[PDB]
Design a protein around this ligand. Structure first.
Ligand SMILES: O=S(=O)(c1ccccc1)N(Cc1ccc(Oc2ccccc2)cc1)c1ccc(C(O)(C(F)(F)F)C(F)(F)F)cc1
Length: 274
């Protein structure tokens, strides 16, 4: 079954998640909002986001934003300031998650920074899948809601952008909170990240989290639908890392044309300021 050590690993991760995941986004406030040539062509990477924004007030008021269509203009950058603020809020939560976990704290500062930089996007996306509604194509973030706008091919066309397909595929697995936090742990403690000194310790931690995840699934999911779940999750994690490397390249190209990264995002991506 589950060993007490395995049950102590899950509890440590689960408590770290509860303390640092504001699932209602109640402290996300004071954020920016959109106002009331091969480089540029590629930089039209932005069209795959296609998101509408809803902001519900406590008074009952609802503000709704619909994005501009591309007209060969700067209007494509209208939502980047808001998204940078949301990304920064999510990343701060992820940093707090790592810092409250005993195993991460024990690691050297240099390794802690290297691991956070490598896994920050992946951990944020894993948390965002918990708030994603597959039926509505919407990410429900407290009073903010982010809805995918209609596209010609509809669902299938959205499933062509890897980030979106990841979200739909992961949600279909119908994971428990314990399985999400183990995926975060496996992704955070990745030994093959640039700059990791204590690779052997990190690799052993990762294997223990994966063993714990495999054991959790074996003990709590006996149904033929959950056959090969551990391996599906591990493949998902491998795809997320490829998505992460692609997203980094897309982001840095936009930044090069149209700077928008916040200070914390600049630190994450090694932008110096000079
Ligand atoms: O993948 S989503 O859900 C998404 C959102 C909208 C349309 C399609 C897909 N996402 C949310 C998200 C937020 C944070 C994150 O982790 C990061 C951690 C540190 C630094 C950067 C990211 C990962 C996903 C999303 C949000 C923004 C972006 C951007 O590339 C954008 F803005 F240039 F499109 C940018 F620049 F803001 F990061 C991409 C995906």
């Amino acid at each position: 079954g589950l060993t007490e050590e395995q049950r102590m690993m899950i509890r440590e991760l689960m408590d770290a998640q509860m303390k640092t995941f504001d699932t209602t986004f109640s402290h996300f406030k004071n954020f920016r909002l959109p106002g009331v040539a091969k480089w540029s062509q590629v930089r039209k990477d932005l069209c795959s986001l296609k998101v509408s924004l809803q902001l519900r007030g406590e008074d009952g008021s609802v503000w709704n934003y619909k994005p501009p269509a591309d007209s060969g203009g700067k209007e494509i950058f209208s939502l980047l300031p808001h998204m940078a603020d949301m990304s920064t809020y999510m990343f701060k939560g992820i940093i707090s998650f790592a810092k409250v976990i005993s195993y991460f704290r024990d690691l050297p500062i240099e390794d802690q920074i290297s691991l956070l930089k490598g896994a920050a996007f992946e951990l944020c996306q894993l948390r965002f899948n918990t708030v994603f509604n597959a039926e509505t194509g919407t990410w429900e973030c407290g009073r903010l809601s982010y809805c995918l706008e209609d596209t010609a091919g509809g669902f299938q066309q959205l499933l062509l952008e890897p980030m979106l397909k990841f979200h739909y595929m992961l949600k279909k697995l119908q994971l428990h909170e314990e399985e999400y936090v183990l995926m975060q742990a496996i992704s955070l403690f990745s030994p093959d990240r640039p700059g990791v000194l204590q690779h052997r310790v990190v690799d052993q931690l990762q294997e223990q989290f994966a063993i714990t995840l495999k054991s959790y699934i074996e003990c709590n999911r006996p149904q033929p639908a959950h056959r090969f779940l551990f391996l599906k999750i591990m493949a998902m994690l491998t795809e997320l890392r490829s998505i992460n490397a692609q997203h980094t390249q897309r982001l840095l190209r936009i930044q090069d044309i149209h700077p928008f990264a916040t200070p914390l995002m600049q630190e994450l991506f090694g932008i110096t300021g000079s």
